[PDB]
Amino acid sequence: AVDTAEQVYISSLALLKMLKHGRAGVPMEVMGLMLGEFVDDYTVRVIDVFAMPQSGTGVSVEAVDPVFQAKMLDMLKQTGRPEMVVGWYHSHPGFGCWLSGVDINTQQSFEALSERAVAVVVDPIQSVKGKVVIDAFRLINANMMVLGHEPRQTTSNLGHLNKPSIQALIHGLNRHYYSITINYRKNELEQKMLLNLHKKSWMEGLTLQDYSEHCKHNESVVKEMLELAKNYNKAVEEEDKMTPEQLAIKNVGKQDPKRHLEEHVDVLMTSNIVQCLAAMLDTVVFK
Amino acid sequence: LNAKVRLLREELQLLQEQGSYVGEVVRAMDKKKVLVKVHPEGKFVVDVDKN
Amino acid sequence: VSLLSESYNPHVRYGAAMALGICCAGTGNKEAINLLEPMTNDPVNYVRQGALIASALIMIQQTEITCPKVNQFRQLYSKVINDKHDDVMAKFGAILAQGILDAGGHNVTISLQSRTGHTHMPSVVGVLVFTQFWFWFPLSHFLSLAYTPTCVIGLNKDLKMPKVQYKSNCKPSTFAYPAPLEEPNFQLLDNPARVMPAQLKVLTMPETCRYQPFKPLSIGGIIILKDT
């Protein structure tokens, strides 16, 4: 009879499949059912996710014949892990990452089966390379406002570690439901696998590109560096006596010396010393 | 460097706020009122700020 | 730690504030409090709570003499706790600050040290488990093991209760009580009386009674009296 300091675990494959299926149906809302378990009364783990055939309108997306869902959850018992359907997710492209009027409609139906039912909202438009926008919502009773929804016996899910947004606070947020804090659990088998999918084998490490293209590239960079330094001379020698507070206001046009020099220093040095070092490695390793 | 990265995070926060309509002043009036005109629409008798 | 309190991430700012609050705790310090003045002015709420807690942990039992910022911060606690529009996680620090400030009727000061610089163990364990109220409320309820009563007492024939009254000739405001809202040179401090380690070194044994304290009194503890 208490909603404690809850937490949701999501696996790596679940998030990757989540974002791929959200992007694959970019202009409308795609659907999905989550696979997981209730590890304890405190936290809920999602270990897998899967998608179904749908039928989408301009503003709505419905399911199809659910013999797919029953037979799929029957067949997934046979290979490996026989979990349950702990929640459902959809997508909200370009929207406020919030539960809408009809989104909250089926949340009652999903909550009527099991109490610990979690909705997940992902968005592939506002998500960028370094951070995917994600949220998990739990429907609260709209009949009980006078009491407390979660006692907050500690300070985990609060202004701690996350802040409520503005657009979520418009369409609902702490009204009619609430949010829960997501953390990612990583097992060692996938932990020491995920950090190595960018490298190459030894032919990439020991390979001189070519010397003709390297000479022509250095010739081109030095050739443009000539005119760039010639512009830099006039840029330094003018330096009109009037405080950069406006010299940064006459710089906002097409003017470019003092700024492209050190970039050319970097691309010259980090492409020459690497090639010379690799040439030495190739000429005395093999012998 | 720490001021720069904190300014970048607060800039990501503050960039969600609204803009500001430019205009030209026709003439000042009494009791700290000016007559401005926006570009597509007509004129407005607006007030001034303390600063 | 001063620049570390200005990091991009507010968890490190909370940690820097709490490190200031548990390191120079029990000794009112000018510069540590000076670093905590702008700490309670920032959009992040839990670092405001930690700043209030760490500031209340370092102004214990010091009444407006060694550090003159006590009254302003004591008004600040009531200002935050009486405000109708603030973060509830922030006012956690405001309600707990009044508890840790006037702890035990202004009779117990938390101190990780002891009589001679030997490390005192229940205080250190209590502060380390006090750092876990971010994860459980009763787990960091442990603070009574971090509280030691700072008094000088001692009884002659095991339980023979004596009468020693003298206090040094310093003005009666450094050692004064907070005198809640609800010029003699010397003062009187009866046989149970509090003494804090800010002017612990100034007091003298009375020269009117025949009993003498044996041990050269510079300690908050237990004495014997030889009634000559």
Contacts of A282 (CB under 8 A, 6+ apart): A206, A208
Q: Which of C3, C4, C6, C8 to mutate to test the interface with B (most CBs of B within 10 A)?
A: C8
CB contacts, 8 Å: C7 with chain B: 2
User: What is the C-alpha separation between C62 and C66, in angstroms, rounded?
Assistant: 7
Contact C89 A160 (CB under 8 A): yes
Tokens 């550090």 belong to C67
- The two structure tokens encoding residue A256: 């470019």
**Which residues are within 8 A (CB) of C204 and not within 5 positions of it... i.e. 6 or more apart?**
C166, C168
* Residue of chain C minimizing CA distance to A4: C136
Q: Which residues contact C157 (CB under 8 A, 6 or more apart)?
A: none
- Residue C8 contacts A where some CB pair is shorter than 8 Å: no
According to the 3-state scheme, what is the secondary structure of A95-140? CCCCCCCCCCHHHHHHHHHCCCCEEEEECCCCCECCECCEEEEEEC
* Chain A, nearest residue to C136 by Cα: A154
Q: Helices C88-101 and C70-81 meet at what angle, rounded to 10?
A: 140
First to last CA, chain A: 76
- Cβ separation A155–C46 shorter than 8 A: yes
Residue-wise burial string across A21-52, b where 16 or more C-beta atoms lie within 10 A, e elsewhere: bbeebeeebbbbbbbbeeeeeebbbbbbbbbe
Would an 8 Å CB–CB cutoff place A159 in contact with chain C?
A: yes
Separation CA C214–CA C223 (nearest Å): 7
By the 8 A CB rule, do C30 and C42 touch? no
Contact across the interface for C87 and A156, Cβ inside 8 Å: no
Q: Is C177 on the interface with A (CB under 8 A)?
A: no
* Residues forming a β-bridge with C222: C153
CA distance C17 to C55: 8
Asked whether C75 and C55 are in contact (CB, 8 A), the reply is no
- How far apart are alpha carbons A209 and A198 in whole angstroms? 20
**DSSP 8-class letter at B31:** S
Phi, psi for residue A146 in degrees, rounded to 5:
-70, -25
Nearest to A160 by CA among C93, C183, C141: C93
Interface contact A159-C89, CB threshold 8 A: yes
3-state class of B33 per DSSP?
A: strand
Contact A154 C133 (CB under 8 A): yes
* N-terminal to C-terminal alpha carbon distance within chain C: 54
Contact call for residues A83 and A36 (beta carbons, < 8 A): yes
Report the alpha-carbon distance of residue C194 to residue A99 in Å, rounded.
Answer: 60
Which three-class secondary structure state does DSSP give residue C171? coil
Given a contact cutoff of 8 angstroms between Cβ atoms, the answer to whether A278 and A208 are in contact is: yes
CB contacts < 8 Å between B and C, how many?
A: 7
What distance in Å separates the CA atoms of residue C50 and residue C36, rounded to the nearest whole number? 10
What 3-state class would DSSP assign to C27? coil
Q: How far is C160 from chain A (nearest CA, A)?
A: 49
The Cα of A161 is separated from the nearest Cα of chain C by a number of Å equal to 9
Exposure of C38 in the CB half-sphere (CA atoms within 13 A): 6
Resolution of the model in angstroms: 3.5
A156 touches chain C (CB under 8 A): yes
First-to-last CA distance in chain B? 32
Is residue A229 within 8 Å of A200, Cβ to Cβ? Answer: no
**Furthest C-alpha separation in chain C:** 67
DSSP state of C119: P
Residues B10-30 as b/e (b if ≥16 CB within 10 A, e otherwise) read eeeeeeeeeeeeebeeeeeee
As a whole number of angstroms, the distance between CA A165 and CA C189 comes to 58
**Sheet order of strands, B24-28 included:** B24-28, B33-37, B43-47
Question: Quick one: how far is CA A191 from the chain centroid?
Answer: 18
C176 within 8 A of C63, measured Cβ to Cβ: yes
Cα–chain-centroid distance for residue A146?
A: 37
Mutant choice from B4, B6, B14 vs C, greatest count of C C-beta within 10 A: B6
CB C189 within 8 A of CB C167: yes
The rounded Cα C176 to chain-centroid distance in angstroms is 14
b/e string for C22-55 if b means 16 or more Cβ within 10 A? bebbbbbbeebbebbeebbeeebbbbbbbbbbbb
CA distance A208 to A205: 9
Among chain B residues, the shortest Cα distance to C10 is held by B6
Contact by Cβ (8 Å): A36, A88: no
Q: How far apart are CA A91 and CA A97, in angstroms?
A: 8
Chains in contact with chain B (at least 3 beta-carbon pairs closer than 8 A):
C
Handedness of CA C193, C195, C200, C203 (dihedral sign): negative
Following DSSP, what letter does each residue of chain A receive, concatenated? ----S-EEEE-HHHHHHHHHHHHHTTTS----EEEEE--SSSEEEEEEEE----EE-SS-EE---THHHHHHHHHHHHSS---EEEEEEEE-TTS-SS--TTTTHHHHHHHHH-SS-EEEEE-SSS-BTTB--EEEEEE--SS--SS-S---SSSSSSSTT----SSHHHHSTTTTEEEE-EEE---HHHHHHHT-SS---HHHHS----HHHHHHHHHHHHHHHHHHHHHHHHHHHH--SS-HHHHTTSSSSS--TTTSHHHHHHHHHHHHHHHHHHHHHHHHH--
Domain boundaries, given as residue ranges, for chain A: 7-195, 206-280
Query: Closest by alpha carbon to C97, among C77, C121, C82, C124?
Result: C77
What distance in Å separates the CA atoms of residue C129 and residue C123, rounded to the nearest whole number?
Answer: 10
CA distance A75 to A70: 9
After which residues, if any, is chain C broken (C to N > 2.5 Å)? Answer: 182
Residue pair C127/C146 in contact (Cβ under 8 Å)? The answer is: yes
| Rounded-to-integer distance, Cα C20 and Cα C13, Å | 11
Instruction: Take residue A187 and report the two structure tokens written for it.
Output: 């097992």
A153 vs C136: CB contact, 8 Å cut-off?
A: yes
CB atoms within 10 A of CB C162: 15
User: Which one of C9, C18, C46 makes the best mutation probe of the A interface by having the most chain A beta carbons within 10 Å?
Assistant: C46
Give the largest CA-CA distance in chain A.
83
Contact of C227 with chain B, judged by CB distance below 8 Å, is answered with no
User: Which positions in chain C touch A6 (Cβ < 8 Å)?
Assistant: none
3-state secondary structure of C202: coil
Which residues in C lie closer than 8 A to residue A153 (C-beta atoms)? 136-137
Specify binding-site residues of A for Zn(2+).
90, 92, 103
Torsion from C-alpha of C28, C31, C33, C37, nearest 10 degrees: 160
Strand partners, A48: A35
Whether residues C89 and A158 touch (CB distance < 8 A) is answered with yes
To the nearest whole angstrom, how far is the Cα of A107 from the nearest Cα of chain C? 29
